[PDB]
Design a protein around this ligand. Structure first.
Ligand SMILES: CCCCCCCCCCCCCCCCCC(=O)OC[C@H](COP(=O)([O-])OCC(O)COP(=O)([O-])OC[C@@H](COC(=O)CCCCCCCCCCCCCCCCC)OC(=O)CCCCCCCCCCCCCCCCC)OC(=O)CCCCCCCCCCCCCCCCC
Ligand SMILES: CCCCCCCCCCCCCCCCCC(=O)OC[C@H](COP(=O)([O-])OCC(O)COP(=O)([O-])OC[C@@H](COC(=O)CCCCCCCCCCCCCCCCC)OC(=O)CCCCCCCCCCCCCCCCC)OC(=O)CCCCCCCCCCCCCCCCC
Ligand SMILES: CCCCCCCCCCCCCCCCCC(=O)OC[C@H](COP(=O)([O-])OCC(O)COP(=O)([O-])OC[C@@H](COC(=O)CCCCCCCCCCCCCCCCC)OC(=O)CCCCCCCCCCCCCCCCC)OC(=O)CCCCCCCCCCCCCCCCC
Ligand SMILES: CCCCCCCCCCCCCCCCC[C@@H](O)O[C@H](CO[C@H](O)CCCCCCCCCCCCCCC)COP(=O)(O)OCC[N+](C)(C)C
Ligand SMILES: CCCCCCCC/C=C\CCCCCCCC(=O)OC[C@H](COP(=O)(O)OCCN)OC(=O)CCCCCCC/C=C\CCCCCCCC
Ligand SMILES: CCCCCCCC/C=C\CCCCCCCC(=O)O[C@H](COC(=O)CCCCCCC/C=C/CCCCCCCC)COP(=O)(O)OCCN
Ligand SMILES: Nc1ncnc2c1ncn2[C@@H]1O[C@H](COP(=O)(O)OP(=O)(O)O)[C@@H](O)[C@H]1O
Lengths: 55, 98, 121, 44, 459, 49, 347, 320, 56
């Protein structure tokens, strides 16, 4: 219950699961320039609205 | 700043957005790039003429020159894309993924 | 960057004349020995990659490797020593030039400094 | 008796386009051995 | 102290320049000679440490560990030349190169006078061990084990580096002598609490702690024999040495901050001792015994009293030797039977009497039989804990009983009873294995003759 | 033997061998002379001897 | 492509980046960027295939957009001060536009999307040039204007780059995409220390360039672009596999290998001025890069994958064209840690 | 100076060495025909270099010394076992087919390199473009599975597309019963086990796929058994041809430079033969691969580079 | 028979010469830390009428 199940569940297995989920989410792009160029536009707007507004 | 400068800046922003939207074609995005270049040229020459920067007057012309290169470059690539697919649609450029 | 802009700095000298007042590193400097060892390792790897007897394939090639590494290392060490000496000189000059920002504090002895005691129990 | 070494079944995990295959990426094909896609039958 | 470091860097090329059938002889002979030379650091001043140069210094805590490592290398070479007989010359030389590099890194780790250099070498020890485990293992799990053995370390040790450089930006130096002489108390604040955690967690996971011990069974089971020897004998003591060196600045925050770690160490020592009873494998039992002993050492270091420090040093040395001997004894049976199950080969006393004697002596030294140094360290730690709190003895007492139980359990399962009736390939013990057992066991008794050499600087 | 021409012949390419050996010797003597000049210049500037 | 045309295009690329790195005029820097892009586009298309064509198209579109915003930033900075010299650039809006343009030129997150795809499309020789040489000019421009860089934006983009590279590299089996994600993570690492000290940026650039060069020339030596294709070279050139494993260990950042020197130094440089959380986050994230390097090493040399029969014929032939600088790059990529203080010669 | 980009930059070009007598000639015929003697006679009369048919140990004759290596180290397959037991469960048939295709690819690369570097023509006895007839014969007779032919098709598609087809293809047409009679009269105990269906499938694949495909790119000169002895007639027909339809007149100096850089450096030629496709017939385990590689390394002249082997009498090693 | 034995066992002196070089290196390192020789407040002592250094 402790070694083979829960101590594995908390530190190593949760880390592996979270990293796998993040890797799947990040590296799943269809390769269409339209979508991530729209993302570029959103990034430009956010940077120009959220960073240099206060100086 | 006078209204002319802000109108030119708004034109540049509109052209940049139009380039970043990528509706269906590729010639439209090249036209958006050329429009951005035209807006930059107009802004630069207005600024140069207003402050009487004499030596800076050849700066816009050099701009235009490289604009042509960019346009030529884009057109060349477009031709190849067409020869690969028979259509300049951006949907076909999806062989490589992330 | 702090030392990129400095008065009286020739752009691409890599070894200003002012650096000639410092003692040159000895030819038996341990860093030079490590550079020669790096050259020898590079020669051995070159022999291994080309599928040649690693230890004794080419003696002239290994000698050239060691010589080139030592030759570059000498001047690299000279420049590094010059840069560190210049940093020390500038720091001392600035400390002397601004005595108010680096005052000489009092020198108390442990007989009058009260430090609170933490028992271990 | 001897040290275990990878076999075909162990090797085939690194054969797909990506690791960790989900349903969406299950239809992704690996690139051709030479990076030359077959010509398309574009009727012009 | 370059008279010890340089001969190892000369062991490297002579190993790479030896004949195809003479590598083992040269390596063993010259490693034994180097250990004999390193035996000269036991002459330690009672006032302060031996400061050879600006980079290397030796204390009463460093010398026994150095001697243990230099003595370890020949034993690993002797144990490794059985399953590597079918290997090619280049791969044998590579294996010996890994062992030599590991010893060199350990030697330079145990004597570095600067904390950043100590960290650099204490992390450089990771590469050869990982290569050995993941290249010369036997089962398919070794790769996974290696991954664990890497990340469980690095995730605990990457913050420490930051803390270290932060200290160098605040105090101005990281030299151990300056750190000890100019040490100042740490106030009670969240910043200091996280500094304490960063400085402690790396050595905690290198012991390991009860909650962070999951990598140890994998690493010690799927590794080859020499990897298990070096992991269980010296590589575990790096965390204890680091904690004993780093706790000087952590005061007085340690007294408040040590409660969760002390509780974890005690309860996990009990839990791992109980786990050792219901084990179907043979190497996992020794791994969990190592975990329990290291938890006791953690308690000793945490309570931070001179008697606790002496007991911690003695227990570290004794556990290293005993665990090495136990791993070798298990490896002999594994080579005979080609399986790790404990109940597979039974009644080996009627077939291998001398190996039965070696098993009995190792099991006796494992359960802290007097007057062996194992009991000396254990009893010093127990007395220090009793002074810390009178209830602790209960837990300690419990552990002792459980310890003896599982030890004798193993000694009864593999040696006594009747043979399995169908294993007919148990050849008589070679001279090499008996010599390895004797070279493991005799130093323990010779040290219990003169214990002051392994009691650390607090003596 | 080898049925092919073996571009690395039974004798080394003496041109390249001579070039490499001469380069090594030239670099070594240049380093010696440079070190001698540097130590002399340092002694003269600091006025030691 | 004719060899004369190829070498003159390479020389034009180098001339463009030289013009960027030696010019004090903003217009000349922009001209150098334009020349670099114009002469770099055909280099990617040296081997003609649809994948190369679309990679070149994506690269051209990204670089053209970045140049457009860079020129707009220059024009705005001129508008608010009649100065052309590459200098402080006080204006916040122009500085933000220049930062975003240079980030997109470099490949920093969230402008990273083009990096893995283009590297995949182009050949290894072409790829090596793209990942190594095409970073000097934007980094130089960033270094010159580093004192005006808003720390929040630059640090956010660097942290995003590190995280995205670490996460993306975990999934790829193709070697070129792995290299691209590693490049993204390394760009984030160097960009992080830029507002504090550009000497550490230059040192990290040099070490990353050396490591990437050694990696790519080793990949070219054993002509494999996938994990499975790389799993065969142990049966042909084991020394290449061993050197490749050592280089991967160095790139992972493990001490005492050379790859540990930049990170360590960067962390130290960020601790001198009360930045504690961020270096810790960077180290714990670079653990992911180390993980996928370790997976590649497991597949490559530390184990023995099954081979094919025809490989026997490959046993009878030698590698004809031999790279001269590979051993030096390997040695500088691994055994150069003890010469850390020599970084003082970089300022 | 070894040919390369620099040698192409100044001076050496390829089109200035072609003397209208390059004429890559491929002679094709069914099993046990007179194609070999016809090829030798054509090479003698036209002054071209004759390339004997690529066997199992062809690659052994190009490296080190011409002496063939052991079957374990090279090939790992035999023709006699294929004839005796074509339906063996160890995958010998497809292993032999793939090895023979790779050997033919290497021979074609060698011939193209010789023609480009010298200008003297070559006469091959069978090309990679006609190697698939045996594959189809094996597949139709059930000797190999479908995955084997799929792997063969993939390898051929990724490899043979980089080269140029032969200028003229010569085919010797021999009826199946005559082939069987010649096989019986030959005397080799293993070739008497070749069934008639195998030869019929070979000739059907030839006449239905190879010749119609080659007619669109080359000139096909079909002959018979009776007219294959007077080599002067076939030489006259070859030298009175019209070579204007193939891609050979459509080659520029840059294309020839790329082809010459490709044909040499045989590692790039054989790169795509060992694709990571795991077929039980050709896949070899790690342990056997290691053992066989260690055995091959211990050969007298195979440990080091072809010029750094003191075992075979090389001297002045320490200065090379 | 010195030829074969020497060419086969020349590797058996690398460790001893390494030890000698290590001792020599320690002494060299030692010679660079003589800043307080015969200057310690605890071991300050007038010299013997023939000796010149307290320790080497
Ligand atoms: C801190 C102190 C110093 C430490 C620094 C680090 C160590 C030194 C520097 C390292 C670089 C130098 C050498 C590296 C290049 C060598 C290439 C090689 O492969 O060697 C094979 C070669 C044997 O080949 P051969 O003789 O030609 O014939 C056999 C065939 O080659 C048949 O060959 P094969 O191809 O068929 O064999 C197959 C084999 C072939 O593959 C290999 O052999 C692996 C090659 C090593 C990797 C190179 C890494 C590059 C450097 C980075 C080092 C990192 C250091 C940090 C620590 C982490 C370690 C990872 O592949 C495998 O077996 C796969 C197994 C997987 C194992 C994974 C481990 C790989 C990484 C190990 C690195 C360890 C550090 C290097 C130690 C020295 C190794 C030679 O070894 C040698 O004979 C030379 C070794 C060095 C000679 C030293 C002699 C010095 C002068 C003699 C006299 C001494 C003084 C006298 C004066 C006294 C006063 C009187
Ligand atoms: C106090 C006794 C005084 C004796 C004076 C002489 C002492 C000589 C010690 C020699 C060093 C130990 C050698 C151990 C390795 C075994 C070598 C071997 O294979 O022999 C085969 C050899 C030939 O037999 P075989 O027919 O081939 O055998 C076939 C089978 O293997 C069948 O073989 P087996 O069935 O004969 O099995 C071997 C035999 C014996 O083998 C062993 O068990 C050796 C291990 C002994 C216990 C280890 C765990 C405890 C650690 C305590 C450390 C004390 C260090 C003292 C200094 C040690 C210096 C080396 O088994 C036992 O006797 C039962 C072992 C449990 C004994 C419990 C003792 C409790 C502590 C006693 C007090 C200690 C301090 C006394 C002073 C206190 C203050 C007044 O037979 C022997 O040599 C037997 C040796 C005599 C037994 C010694 C038992 C007591 C030793 C205590 C340490 C020495 C004390 C010296 C100070 C004066 C006292
Ligand atoms: C600190 C920062 C360090 C710099 C950062 C790293 C720099 C990376 C440079 C990337 C260059 C890419 C490359 O050349 O391939 C890498 C190459 C491996 O590629 P490969 O597969 O052997 O290349 C096949 C050829 O490119 C196949 O090409 P091909 O056969 O069509 O070309 C003919 C050949 C032969 O060229 C000629 O025939 C010369 C003709 C002269 C005509 C002159 C025309 C002038 C205008 C009129 O030309 C070349 O191979 C390339 C020439 C490049 C000239 C560069 C001048 C500057 O290895 C290296 O270049 C070394 C990498 C490290 C360089 C040193 C880095 C530290 C210094
Ligand atoms: C990680 C290994 C990297 C190795 C790099 C390649 C080594 C061989 C290449 C040969 C070196 C020669 C290059 C330059 C020599 C002459 C040019 C000289 O004039 O350059 C001047 C000085 O030279 C360079 O600045 C320094 C070159 C020294 C390179 C060594 C640094 C390596 C990092 C330390 C790790 C140890 C590596 C050991 C290598 C064997 C430039 O001064 P300056 O115009 O004012 O700089 C403006 C830009 N700044 C201020 C922002 C920097
Ligand atoms: C927020 C970002 C923080 C970054 C912290 C991450 C530290 C690095 C940990 C790396 C874990 C990556 C493992 C992973 O994701 O892969 C899943 C992987 C699947 O295996 P593959 O061979 O890749 O797939 C084949 C099947 N198709 O799962 C596994 O098998 C796990 C193997 C390695 C286990 C290592 C466990 C170590 C974790 C211990 C604690 C370290 C975590 C770091 C943070 C600690 C908390 C302060
Ligand atoms: C096997 C896996 C084990 C994982 C262990 C990892 C946890 C290690 C403990 C935390 C490490 C980070 C601490 C930071 C390093 C010390 C540096 C320091 O002390 O500076 C502090 C800064 O302290 C911090 O910023 C710490 C922030 C922590 C961020 C990262 C959190 C990581 C996870 C938190 C919980 C971990 C602790 C328990 C883990 C137990 C193991 C599971 C002081 O700030 P100053 O700039 O000097 O200003 C003060 C004066 N005005
Ligand atoms: N791809 C192949 N598969 C199987 N066997 C082949 C293949 N290629 C050539 N062979 C064998 O090579 C043998 C010799 O070829 P052949 O021309 O018929 O005899 P000869 O050399 O006397 O003219 C033949 O028995 C044929 O079966």
């Amino acid at each position: 219950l402790l070694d083979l199940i829960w101590l594995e569940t908390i530190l190593p297995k949760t880390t592996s699961f979270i990293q796998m989920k993040m890797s799947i989410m990040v590296s799943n792009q269809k390769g269409l320039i339209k979508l991530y160029f729209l993302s570029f536009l959103i990034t430009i707007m956010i940077s120009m609205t959220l960073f240099n507004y206060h100086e | 700043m006078p209204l002319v400068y802000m109108n030119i800046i708004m034109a540049f922003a509109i052209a940049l957005a139009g380039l970043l939207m990528y509706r269906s074609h590729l010639m439209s995005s090249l036209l958006c790039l050329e429009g951005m270049m035209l807006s930059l040229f107009i802004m630069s020459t207005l600024i140069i003429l207003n402050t009487h920067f004499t030596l800076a007057n050849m700066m816009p012309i050099i701009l235009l020159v490289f604009a042509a290169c960019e346009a030529a470059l884009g057109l060349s690539l477009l031709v190849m894309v067409s020869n690969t697919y028979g259509t300049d649609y951006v949907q076909n450029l999806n062989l490589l993924q992330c | 960057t702090m030392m990129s802009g400095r008065p009286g700095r020739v752009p691409l000298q890599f070894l200003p004349n002012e650096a000639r007042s410092l003692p040159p590193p000895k030819l038996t400097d341990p860093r030079l020995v490590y550079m020669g060892f790096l050259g020898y390792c590079s020669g051995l790897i070159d022999n291994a990659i080309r599928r040649r007897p690693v230890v004794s394939a080419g003696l002239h090639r290994q000698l050239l490797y060691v010589t080139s590494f030592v030759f570059f290392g000498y001047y690299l060490l000279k420049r590094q020593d010059y840069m560190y000496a210049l940093r020390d000189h500038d720091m001392f000059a600035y400390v002397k030039s601004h005595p108010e920002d680096f005052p000489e504090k009092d020198k108390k002895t442990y007989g009058e400094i009260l430090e609170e005691f933490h028992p271990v129990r | 008796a001897r040290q275990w070494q990878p076999d075909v079944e162990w090797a085939e995990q690194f054969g797909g386009a990506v690791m960790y295959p989900t349903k969406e990426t299950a239809h992704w094909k690996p690139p051709p051995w030479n990076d030359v896609d077959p010509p398309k039958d574009t009727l012009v | 102290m370059l008279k010890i470091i340089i001969p190892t860097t000369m062991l490297l090329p002579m190993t790479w320049m030896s004949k195809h059938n003479m590598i083992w002889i040269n390596a063993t002979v010259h490693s034994l000679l180097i250990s004999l030379i390193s035996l000269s650091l036991l002459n330690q001043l009672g006032e302060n440490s031996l400061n050879f140069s600006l980079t290397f210094f030796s204390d009463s805590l460093s010398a026994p560990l150095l001697v243990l490592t230099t003595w370890l290398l020949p034993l690993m070479l002797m144990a490794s030349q059985s399953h590597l007989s079918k290997e090619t010359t280049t791969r044998k030389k590579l294996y010996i190169t890994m062992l030599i590099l590991l010893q060199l890194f350990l030697i330079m780790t145990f004597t570095a006078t600067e904390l950043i250099l100590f960290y650099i070498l204490f992390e450089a020890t990771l590469v050869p061990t990982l290569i050995i485990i993941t290249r010369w293992g036997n089962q398919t799990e070794r790769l996974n084990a290696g991954l664990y053995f890497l990340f469980y370390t690095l995730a605990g040790s990457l913050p420490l580096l930051v803390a270290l450089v932060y200290i160098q930006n605040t105090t101005g130096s990281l030299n151990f002598l300056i750190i000890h002489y100019w040490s100042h108390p740490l106030s009670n604040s969240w910043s200091n609490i996280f500094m304490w955690l960063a400085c402690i967690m790396a050595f905690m996971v290198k012991m390991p702690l009860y909650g962070l011990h999951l990598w140890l069974p994998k690493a010690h089971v799927e590794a080859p024999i020499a990897g298990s020897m070096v992991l269980a004998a010296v590589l575990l003591k790096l965390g204890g040495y680091g904690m004993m060196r780093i706790t000087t600045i952590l005061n007085p925050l340690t007294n408040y901050m040590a409660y969760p770690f002390l509780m974890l160490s005690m309860w996990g020592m009990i839990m791992t001792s109980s786990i050792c009873l219901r084990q179907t494998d043979l190497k996992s039992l020794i791994a969990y015994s190592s975990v329990s002993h290291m938890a006791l050492v953690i308690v000793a270091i945490m309570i931070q009293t001179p008697w606790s420090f002496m007991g911690a040093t003695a227990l570290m040395i004794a556990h290293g030797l005993t665990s090495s001997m136990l791993f070798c004894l298990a490896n002999t049976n594994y080579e005979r039977v080609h399986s790790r199950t404990m109940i597979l080969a039974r009644g080996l006393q009627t077939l291998l009497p001398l190996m039965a004697t070696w098993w009995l002596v190792a099991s006796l030294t494992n359960l802290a039989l007097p007057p062996s140094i194992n009991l000396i360290g254990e009893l010093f730690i127990i007395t220090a804990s009793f002074s810390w709190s009178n209830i602790t003895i209960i837990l300690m007492g419990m552990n002792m009983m459980i310890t003896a139980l599982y030890s004798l359990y193993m000694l009864i399962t593999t040696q006594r009873g009747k043979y399995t009736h169908h294993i007919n390939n148990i050849k008589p013990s070679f001279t090499r294995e008996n010599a390895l057992m004797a070279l493991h066991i005799l130093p323990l008794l010779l040290l219990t003759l003169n214990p002051k050499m392994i009691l650390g600087p607090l003596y | 033997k080898f049925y092919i021409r073996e571009p690395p012949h039974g004798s080394p390419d003496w041109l390249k061998v001579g070039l490499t050996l001469g380069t090594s010797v030239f670099l070594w003597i240049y380093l010696i002379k440079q070190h001698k000049e540097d130590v002399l210049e340092y002694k003269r500037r600091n006025g030691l001897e | 492509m004719n060899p004369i045309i190829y070498t003159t295009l390479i020389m034009t690329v180098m001339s463009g980046t030289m013009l960027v790195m030696i010019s004090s005029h903003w217009l000349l820097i922009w001209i150098g960027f334009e020349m670099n892009l114009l002469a770099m586009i055909p280099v990617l298309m040296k081997n003609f295939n649809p994948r190369a064509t679309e990679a070149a198209t994506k690269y051209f579109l990204t670089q053209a957009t970045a140049s457009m915003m860079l020129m707009m930033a220059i024009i705005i900075n001129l508008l608010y001060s009649g100065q052309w010299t590459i200098t402080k650039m006080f204006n916040p809006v122009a500085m933000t536009m220049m930062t975003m343009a240079l980030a997109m030129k470099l490949g920093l997150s969230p402008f990273h999307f083009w990096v893995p795809e283009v590297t995949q499309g182009i050949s290894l020789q072409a790829g090596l040039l793209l990942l190594t040489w095409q970073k000097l000019a934007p980094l130089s421009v960033l270094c010159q204007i580093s004192q005006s860089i808003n720390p929040n934006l630059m640090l956010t983009m660097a942290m995003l780059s590190i995280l995205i590279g670490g996460w993306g590299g975990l999934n790829q089996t193709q070697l070129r995409k792995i290299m691209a994600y590693s490049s993204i993570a390394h760009m984030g690492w160097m960009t992080a220390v830029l507002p504090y000290n550009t000497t550490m940026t230059i040192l990290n650039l040099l070490i990353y360039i050396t490591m990437t060069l050694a990696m790519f020339m080793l990949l070219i030596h054993s002509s494999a672009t996938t994990t499975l294709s790389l799993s065969h070279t142990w049966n042909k050139m084991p020394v290449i596999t061993s050197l490749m494993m050592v280089t991967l260990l160095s790139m992972g950042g493990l001490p005492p290998l050379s790859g540990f020197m930049p990170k360590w130094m960067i962390i130290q440089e960020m601790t001198k001025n009360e930045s504690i959380i961020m270096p810790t986050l960077m180290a714990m994230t670079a653990l992911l890069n180390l993980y996928f390097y370790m997976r590649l090493a497991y597949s490559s040399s530390l184990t023995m994958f099954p081979s094919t029969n025809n490989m026997k014929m490959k046993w009878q032939f030698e590698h004809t064209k031999q790279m001269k600088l590979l051993p030096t790059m390997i040695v500088l990529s691994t055994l150069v840690l003890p010469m850390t203080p020599a970084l003082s010669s970089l300022n | 100076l070894q040919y390369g980009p620099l040698a192409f930059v100044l001076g050496e070009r390829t089109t200035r060495k072609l003397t209208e007598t390059s004429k890559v000639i491929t002679v094709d015929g069914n099993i046990c025909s007179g194609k070999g003697r016809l090829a030798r006679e054509i090479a003698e009369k036209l002054g071209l270099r004759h390339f004997p048919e690529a066997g199992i140990h062809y690659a052994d004759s190009t490296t080190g010394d011409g002496k063939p290596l052991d079957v374990q180290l090279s090939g790992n397959c035999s023709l006699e076992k294929f004839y005796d037991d074509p339906k063996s469960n160890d995958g010998n048939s497809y292993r032999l087919q793939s090895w023979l295709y790779a050997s033919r690819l290497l021979q074609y690369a060698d011939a193209l390199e010789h023609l480009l570097s010298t200008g003297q023509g070559v006469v091959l006895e069978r090309s990679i473009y006609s190697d698939f007839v045996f594959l189809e014969a094996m597949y139709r007779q059930g000797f190999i599975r479908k995955q084997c032919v799929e792997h063969y098709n993939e390898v051929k598609k990724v490899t043979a597309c980089e080269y140029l087809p032969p200028h003229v293809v010569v085919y010797v047409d021999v009826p199946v019963p005559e082939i069987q009679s010649r096989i019986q009269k030959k005397g080799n105990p293993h070739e008497m086990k070749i069934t008639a269906a195998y030869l019929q499938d070979i000739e059907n694949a030839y006449k239905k796929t190879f010749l119609p495909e080659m007619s669109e790119k080359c000139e096909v000169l079909q002959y018979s058994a009776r007219e294959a002895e007077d080599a002067e007639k076939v030489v006259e027909d070859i030298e009175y041809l019209k070579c204007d339809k193939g891609p050979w007149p459509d080659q520029d100096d840059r294309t020839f430079h790329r082809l010459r850089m490709l044909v040499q450096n045989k590692l790039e030629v054989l790169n795509y033969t060992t694709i990571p496709v795991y077929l039980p017939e050709i896949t070899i385990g790690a342990h056997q691969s290691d053992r066989v590689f260690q055995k091959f390394t211990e050969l007298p002249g195979r440990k080091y580079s072809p010029g750094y082997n003191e075992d075979v009498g090389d001297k002045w090693i320490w200065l090379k | 028979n010195v030829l074969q034995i020497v060419r086969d066992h020349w590797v058996h002196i690398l460790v001893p010469v390494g030890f000698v070089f290590g001792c020599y290196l320690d002494r060299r390192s030692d010679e660079k830390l003589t800043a307080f020789r015969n200057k310690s407040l605890l071991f300050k002592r007038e010299l013997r009428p023939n000796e010149e250094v307290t320790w080497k």
